[PDB]
Every structure is written in structure tokens, then in C-alpha cells.
Amino acid sequence: GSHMALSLTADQMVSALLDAEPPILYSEYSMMGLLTNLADRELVHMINWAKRVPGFVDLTLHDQVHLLESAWLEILMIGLVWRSMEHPGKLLFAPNLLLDRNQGKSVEGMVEIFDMLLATSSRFRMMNLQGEEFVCLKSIILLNSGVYTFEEKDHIHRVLDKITDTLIHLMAKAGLTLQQQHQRLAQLLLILSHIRHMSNKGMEHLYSMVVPSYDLLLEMLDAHRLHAP
Amino acid sequence: LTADQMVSALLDAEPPILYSEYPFSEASMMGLLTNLADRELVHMINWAKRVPGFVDLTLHDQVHLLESAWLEILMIGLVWRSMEHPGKLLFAPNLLLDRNQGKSVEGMVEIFDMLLATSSRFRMMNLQGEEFVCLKSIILLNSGVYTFLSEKDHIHRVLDKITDTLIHLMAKAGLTLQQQHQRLAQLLLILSHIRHMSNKGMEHLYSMVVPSYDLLLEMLDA
Ligand SMILES: O=C(O)CCN1CCc2c([nH]c3ccccc23)[C@H]1c1ccc(Cl)cc1
Ligand SMILES: O=C(O)CCN1CCc2c([nH]c3ccccc23)[C@H]1c1ccc(Cl)cc1
């Protein structure tokens, strides 16, 4: 059978998001080349993951591609900062690609982006971000980042409301007071503004020096239909 | 301060609505929009000094936060004022510009479209004045808080207090517990889009003006 997104309980939402989680990939081996190769491989898995975020396949294909084109670098970044949280001062791009600030100095313009990513990872560490919170934030990014550069918009907002309910549930079951739930919610959501900022400055840097286009993402999203179950 | 005193302090500190210099070309429009921005900036400083918690920061921290947030602050203002003018941006009472007028300036129309989509979002949520001021203060305290080079708990403490406040206004207005977190989230997710617009606006302004760190410091110090 199939669950419609708005019917899911918080436990079904959490389970759906955990089961959709992509794998941790390895670097295949210049720093930019490694980071580009890794991003390209991550993107394949990201398509598979997006298709499994409750609500996403309710949208038309052209709206799917809108959302993913807006969000893909933020998505890459949040998963990076997540994985990096237990390595203070380092970015765990892969288990065999743990880079420090000084290594970021090898590409002109890169240290400023490395520094921002690091500040984010350290902020998640200090908040003790949990895996089940992470997955909710990541799915938020996907449905939100492109929501305002477009009845159907209502649906995405209702899905977003379900994810917020889900984060609140997690926080209430972890023993936070109603007031602490609201504060922690707000703190996590304001970090999302910083992720957007990092993605904007990242895009500018990539364009200053090939990035996933609209057309590429469209094709990838479409091609997913042909993959073996 | 109580949630109610926070709200009164913020409303009290609001800046004044300004007029644009008393049909439009591109040089004329950019100049109008630049001059209005420059004039808003001195009032923005006075507003920033009365956001509770902000004067307790060191001068350098004040400047960093303002430098990071200034454009999002103007933009949120603008979007707020434009709420009731669907398809138009109310830069001033005597400067109400539509999409098409945007197209006078190469690159501008995209930023215009995004600002209109925000205004139209705020309209559909029925954003209230008391919520607006809380959001604007959140931007000032949050935008630059993760981009410091190296106290920051102080800013986080204030940010938490605006959250409480946002909730209390919702509770006052009779939202259920569930509705309160859902609204909170909806409002704070819009701040991502404000941030994005500020980034895109910075790039667009760099294709041509922008207040320096040192100028901000002077103005805040004086
Ligand atoms: O240049 C910048 O300022 C942004 C750099 N990006 C930082 C985030 C990021 C990159 N590769 C990744 C692989 C996995 C996770 C996160 C990343 C890299 C990256 C490199 C190339 C491409 Cl096409 C996409 C992302
Ligand atoms: O070109 C862009 O993408 C950004 C354009 N900005 C949009 C928001 C904005 C401008 N002037 C304003 C005056 C009041 C409120 C909002 C604004 C204008 C602007 C013009 C000059 C300067 Cl220095 C700053 C802001």
C-alpha cells in the first residue's frame, strides 16, 4: 500500500526518513577534483533519497527539479557538516577524505567556505544534534529552499508542518519542555538560514573557477524511473 | 524583561517611514533606491541600538552583525510595507514599483520577483506587526552570528527570548500548542529566503554603493 505524506505519524515520518538515508561514500583516489567527483556521486543517491521524502513525488516533475536545483548544495553541505560533527576543526568529506582548514587553503576562495562549514558542524555538536533531527532538517531544506521562487504550494507547506510536528515529537520524547522544544526548533531552523548562505557563497565560488544544471537534474530525476527496484 | 516588555520595546524602536526624493529611468530608479537605502541606514543604526541586548555587545560585534544583516533588514522592511500592495513594492509612499518597473535595471527583475513572492507569503500567513518586529530583530542577531572569526551565548540567549516572545504572541492570539510550533517554523523558514535574497542582491549590487565595515563602525560609534 502507500501512505499519503499527511497521514504519517511522527514515528512513520522518522522511519520513512531514516530508511531513505543515502550511503556514506568514499573518495575515489587535486582537491577540487576529489570534491567534484564526490559531489557527482552523492547527487545520484540524492535523487533516490529525494524521491523517498514524503510528498516529494506528489509534485510534478518540473516542480521536483525546481526544488532539487535550489537545494542540492545545501543538502550536500548539511550531510557534510553532520558527518563532521565528531571531528572538531575538520570536514569529513569521506572516511578517507578528512580535511582541515589548512588544506582548504590549497584552493583560492575555499577557506572562507571551509570556515563556515566548520562553524556549522561545531554548532550542531554543541547542540547535540540527533540523527532523527538531522534527517528532518535535511528534508525541510529540500521542500523549503525553492518553495518561494516558484493549492500545490499549500501541500508542500502542509508537508513541512508534518516534519515540524515530527521534530517537536522527537524533542518532547527526549524530555524537553514545551518552551525548550520551541527554542531548540528555532535554533535549528535559524541554522538553516546559515546553510542557505553557505550554499549561495559556494555557488558563487564554483561559478568563479561544472555545477549541476537545471537540465542535468531534470534528466537525472527522470532517469530514476528506469532504475531497477 | 517579560515577553510583553520585549514586544513593546521592539515596537517602540521601529524606525520611521521615509519618502523617496521628491516617469522613471534606470539611473533615476537605482539612484532613488540607493539614496533611500543610505537614508534608511542611519535610522537602522538607531533601531539596532534599541534592540534589547545589542548595545551590550562590543562595538566590533555590533558592526559585524549589522554588516551581515543590513540588506536583509532593508528587504524585510520593504516586504512588510508591501504586504497590502500585491504585485508592487512599496519602497516609499511616493515610490511604489511594479515588476515591470523592475525591468528598467538589468538583473533587477529577478530580485524584484523574489521580494514580491515574500510579500505575498507574509500576506497569506497574515503576518502581524508584533511578529514582524521579532523577525527583524532575529535577523540582526542571527545573520552574522556563525560568521564570526573567533559572548556568542549572550546573542543566543537573546535569540531564545525572541522565540519565547513569538510564541507568547501566538498563545495570546489563541493558537493551539500544535499551531504555535507550526507558525514558528513557517516564519523562521522565511528567513532562509530573506538570506538568499540578500545574497543575490549583494551580487547584483556588485555588478555596478555598498556600506563598508568602517562606515558602519563610524556610524555606530557616533
Ligand atoms: O566551492 C565551493 O565553495 C563549494 C565546494 N563544495 C563544498 C561542499 C561539497 C563539495 N563536495 C562535496 C561532496 C560531499 C559533500 C559536500 C561537498 C564541494 C563541491 C565541489 C564541486 C561541486 Cl560541482 C559541488 C560541490
Ligand atoms: O540591486 C539589488 O539586487 C538590490 C536592490 N535593493 C533592493 C532592496 C532595497 C533597495 N533600496 C531600498 C530602500 C528601502 C528598502 C529596501 C530597499 C535596493 C538597494 C539599492 C542600492 C543599495 Cl546600496 C542597497 C539596496
Q: Which residues pair with A97 in a beta bridge?
A: A94
- Give the Cα separation of B72 and A21 in Å (integer): 34
Chain A positions touching B186 (Cβ under 8 A) are 157, 160-161
For A217, other C-beta atoms within 10 Å of its C-beta total: 21
Contact assessment for residue B22 and residue B30, using Cβ atoms and an 8 Å cutoff? no
* Among the bound ligands, the one closest to the CA of A118: 1
The radius of gyration computed from the CA coordinates of chain B, to the nearest angstrom, equals 17
Listed in sequence order, the residues at least 6 apart from B29 whose beta carbon sits closer than 8 Å to its beta carbon are B97, B101, B104, B105
Cα of B24 vs centre of ligand 1, distance in Å, is: 43
Residue identifier of the C-alpha nearest atom 22 of ligand 1: A36
Cβ atoms within 10 Å, residue B49: 12
For the Cβ of B197 lying below 6 angstroms from any atom of ligand 2, the answer is: no
Chain B CB contacts of A196 below 8 Å: 192-193, 195-196, 199
User: Does any CB of chain A come closer than 8 Å to the CB of residue B165?
Assistant: no
* Technique that determined the structure: X-ray
Q: Which helix (H) or strand (E) holds B172?
A: helix B152-172
Q: Are A222 and B220 in contact (CB under 8 A)?
A: no
Q: Which of B33, B103, B136 to mutate to test the pocket of ligand 2 (most atoms within 8 A of CB)?
A: B33
Phi first, then psi: give them for residue B66, nearest 5 degrees.
-65, -45
Exposed/middle/buried for A126, CB within 10 Å: 0-12, 13-18, 19+? exposed
Q: Which three cell numbers stand for residue A35?
A: 570534491
Could you give the CA distance from residue B83 to residue B37 in angstroms, rounded to a whole number? 19
Whole-angstrom Cα distance, residue B58 to residue B41? 20
- Domain count of the fold of chain A: 1
* A136 alpha carbon – ligand 2 mean position (Å): 34
Chain B residue closest in CA terms to A146: B193
Rounded to an integer, what distance in angstroms lies between the CA atom of residue B83 and that of residue A96?
51
- The amino acid present at B146, given as its one-letter code, is Y
**Count of other CB atoms within 10 angstroms of residue A203:** 14
**A59 C-beta neighbours (distance < 10 Å), count:** 17
Which of B190, B65, B127 minimizes the C-alpha distance to A186?
B190
Q: Is the CB of A39 under 6 A from ligand 1?
A: yes
Distance CA A126, CA A132 (A): 16
DSSP 8-state symbol, B177: H
Indicate whether residue B209 lines ligand 2 (CB < 6 A).
yes
Nearest Cα residue to A155 out of A54, A51, A12, A55: A55
In this complex, do A149 and B114 lie within 8 Å of one another by their Cβ atoms?
A: yes
Report the CATH number that the domain containing residue B22 is assigned in CATH: 1.10.565.10
Which residue range is the domain that position B91 belongs to? 1-222
